[PDB]
Amino acid sequence: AQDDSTPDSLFAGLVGEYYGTNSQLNNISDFRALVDSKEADATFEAANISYGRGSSDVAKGTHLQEFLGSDASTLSTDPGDNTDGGIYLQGYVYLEAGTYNFKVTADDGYEITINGNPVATVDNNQSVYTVTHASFTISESGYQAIDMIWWDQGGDYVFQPTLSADGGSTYFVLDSAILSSTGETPYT
Ligand SMILES: OC[C@H]1O[C@H](O)[C@H](O)[C@@H](O)[C@@H]1O
Ligand SMILES: [Ca+2]
Ligand SMILES: [Ca+2]
Ligand SMILES: [Ca+2]
Ligand SMILES: [Ca+2]
Ligand SMILES: [Ca+2]
Ligand SMILES: [Ca+2]
Ligand SMILES: [Ca+2]
Ligand SMILES: [Ca+2]
Numbered sequence: 001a002q003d004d005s006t007p008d009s010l011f012a013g014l015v016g017e018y019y020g021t022n023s024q025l026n027n028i029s030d031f032r033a034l035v036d037s038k039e040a041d042a043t044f045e046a047a048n049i050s051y052g053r054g055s056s057d058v059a060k061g062t063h064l065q066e067f068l069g070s071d072a073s074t075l076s077t078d079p080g081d082n083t084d085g086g087i088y089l090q091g092y093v094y095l096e097a098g099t100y101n102f103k104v105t106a107d108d109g110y111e112i113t114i115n116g117n118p119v120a121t122v123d124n125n126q127s128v129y130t131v132t133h134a135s136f137t138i139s140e141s142g143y144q145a146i147d148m149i150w151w152d153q154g155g156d157y158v159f160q161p162t163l164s165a166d167g168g169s170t171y172f173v174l175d176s177a178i179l180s181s182t183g184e185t186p187y188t
Pocket of ligand 3 (some may be wrong): 035040
């Protein structure tokens with residue numbers, strides 16, 4: 001819902017913020033502290049949340065643009081170089097009541113929360129790895145609150161958090177089919 005005096009862009013995606021740093025990101029706490037510490041280095045619309053893979057540091061050169069791919073055209077600016085960096089995504093996802101689980105491929109770590117509760121967590125650095133996470137329930141059909149953080153401490157980078165509604169038999173990428181920046185229905 002609206003919570004201030006600023007109209008918010010309605011689009012079929014999550015609100016994305018990118019933050020870079022020249023300090024080391026070791027874990028979720030480090031990245032959240034970076035987000036806390038300053039304004040985003042860039043904003044974007046996260047409409048197709050399947051990013052990377054690439055090499056030679058996400059925070060260098062045009063690597064962020066390459067990583068974000070189809071979403072990069074919504075960047076507010078081209079950040080300068082940093083050694084480390086990551087993204088913070090927030091908004092809504094349409095889910096019917098039922099049981100779900102994430103399966104996430106990433107380098108480095110990440111955390112996804114739904115309706116305030118963590119549902120997929122890797123609290124450390126790692127080369128590319130895919131985790132099938134534990135199932136969670138959605139009690140009421142509709143737009144659920146969702147946020148994500150992901151970061152790269154350096155080197156390679158990838159982030160693809162897929163979701164299953166059928167007990168792990170099939171998984172889908174979160175994209176414009178079901179994402180909403182504000183919780184209103186997007187017609188874009
Ligand atoms: O230790 C974690 C690191 O392992 C390797 O260096 C990977 O290339 C790098 O992307 C990852 O961040
Ligand atoms: Ca607002
Ligand atoms: Ca901030
Ligand atoms: Ca750049
Ligand atoms: Ca891509
Ligand atoms: Ca685009
Ligand atoms: Ca680093
Ligand atoms: Ca990395
Ligand atoms: Ca399958």
